[PDB]
């Protein structure tokens, strides 16, 4: 529908360079999909060649093995998340000049490798190889232009996940109820640290040209849309 995998030539009129790049940053079941789909449609209405990319686009067929056999599959499935996200951005954002609304940016994947390194599922040597490739890939992708910091509390994530799994609107990704609870909590803690890093790197680090926006994951979806649209509308190019 959104022409995400077109290997044909760029069609951006007279506008040169990459499109613009909006990303949500937060733990699972933060309430992202209504937001990013609405934003992509409103940016298109303003004349932007914009697309919204749900993270489910990047779910490998083998995703569940990351969580049921993590010391075997966490390293290559983490490579898959960063590689497939990279390729989609390199083609759509950079090569074809389109504007992206992402449920997760290329800057967030490293924290998921950190989680598996701490648990022991990914070795230090695997992490070093990952980081070498990640640095080369990320150097070819512009920083996100607007990052929405939206980290849900763990019990909110788990309530939303439980309802979605019960009604069959998403699959059961974890090997046990406790594995789901534990990964959600470990990711929550890492995301709190990552967002504090973001606040620093937007002032004294590599993101001084990027806008950060804080957003409560428990806010109503209409409030989320209104808050993020007020900043995203400014980024429209034809």
Ligand X SMILES: Nc1ccn([C@@H]2S[C@](CO)(OP(=O)(O)OP(=O)(O)O)[C@@H](O)[C@H]2O)c(=O)n1
180 binds ligand X (CB under 6 A): no
- Chosen from ligand X, a second copy, none, partner binding at 30 (C-beta under 5 to 8 Å by type): ligand X
For residue 9, the surrounding DSSP H or E stretch is none
The answer for residues whose C-beta is within 8 angstroms of residue 68's C-beta and 6 or more apart is: 174, 175
- Chosen from ligand X, a second copy, none, partner binding at 55 (C-beta under 5 to 8 Å by type): ligand X
Q: Which CB atom, from 25 or from 127, has the smaller least distance to a second copy? A: 127
Single residue of 87, 203, 218, 226 touching a second copy by CB under 8 A: 87
Distance between CA 151 and CA 139 in Å, rounded? Answer: 26
For residue 3, which of 78, 66, 53, 61 has the smallest C-alpha distance? 53
- Chosen from ligand X, a second copy, none, partner binding at 236 (C-beta under 5 to 8 Å by type): none
At closest approach, how far in Å is the CB of 189 from a second copy?
27
For residue 101, the surrounding DSSP H or E stretch is strand 99-102
Instruction: Name the DSSP class of 1.
Output: -
69 binds a second copy (CB under 8 A): yes
For residue 237, which of 115, 75, 132, 93 has the smallest C-alpha distance? 93
Distance between CA 141 and CA 25 in Å, rounded? Answer: 17
- Chosen from a second copy, ligand X, none, partner binding at 191 (C-beta under 5 to 8 Å by type): none
With CB under 6 A as the contact rule, which of the stretches 27-35, 128-136, 200-208, 222-230 interacts with ligand X?
Answer: 27-35
For residue 102, which of 128, 84, 124, 120 has the smallest C-alpha distance? 84
The residues that bridge with 52 in the sheet, in sequence order, are 101
Q: Which CB atom, from 24 or from 141, has the smaller least distance to a second copy? A: 141
Considering only residues 145 to 164 of the shown chain, the ones binding a second copy according to CB under 8 A are: none
**Residue found by looking up tokens 């914009």 in the block:** 50
- Chosen from a second copy, ligand X, none, partner binding at 165 (C-beta under 5 to 8 Å by type): none
Size of the site for a second copy (CB under 8 A): 35
* Ordered strands of the 99-102 beta sheet: 50-53, 99-102, 21-25, 146-149, 211-214
Site string for a second copy, 96-135 (x = CB under 8 A): -----------------------------xx-xxx-xx-x
Which chain residues interact with a second copy by CB under 8 A? 5, 7, 60-65, 68-69, 72-73, 75-77, 79-80, 83, 86-87, 90-91, 94-95, 125-126, 128-130, 132-133, 135-137, 140
């Amino acid at each position: 529908e959104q022409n995400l995998y077109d290997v044909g030539p760029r069609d951006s009129g007279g506008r040169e360079g990459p499109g613009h790049y909006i990303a949500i940053s937060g733990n699972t079941a933060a309430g992202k999909t209504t937001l990013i789909e609405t934003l992509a449609g409103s940016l298109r209405a303003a004349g932007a060649d914009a697309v919204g990319v749900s993270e489910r686009v990047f779910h490998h067929r083998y995703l569940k093995l990351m969580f049921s056999a993590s010391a075997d599959f966490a390293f290559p499935i983490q490579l898959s998340f960063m590689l497939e996200r990279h390729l989609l951005l390199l083609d759509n954002l950079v090569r074809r000049g389109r504007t992206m609304v992402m449920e997760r940016s290329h800057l967030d994947d490293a924290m998921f490798v950190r989680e598996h390194v701490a648990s022991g599922a990914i070795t230090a040597a695997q992490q070093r190889a990952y980081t070498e490739v990640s640095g080369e890939l990320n150097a070819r992708i512009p920083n996100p232009d607007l990052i929405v910091l939206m980290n849900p509390e763990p019990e909110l994530s788990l309530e939303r996940l439980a309802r979605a799994e019960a009604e069959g609107s998403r699959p059961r990704q974890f090997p046990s109820d406790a594995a789901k609870r534990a990964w959600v909590h470990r990711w929550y803690d890492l995301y709190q640290e990552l967002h504090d890093d973001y606040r620093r790197r937007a002032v004294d680090g590599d993101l001084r040209g990027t806008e950060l926006l804080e957003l409560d994951a428990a806010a109503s979806p209409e409030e989320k849309i209104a808050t993020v649209t007020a900043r995203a509308r400014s980024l429209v190019v034809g």
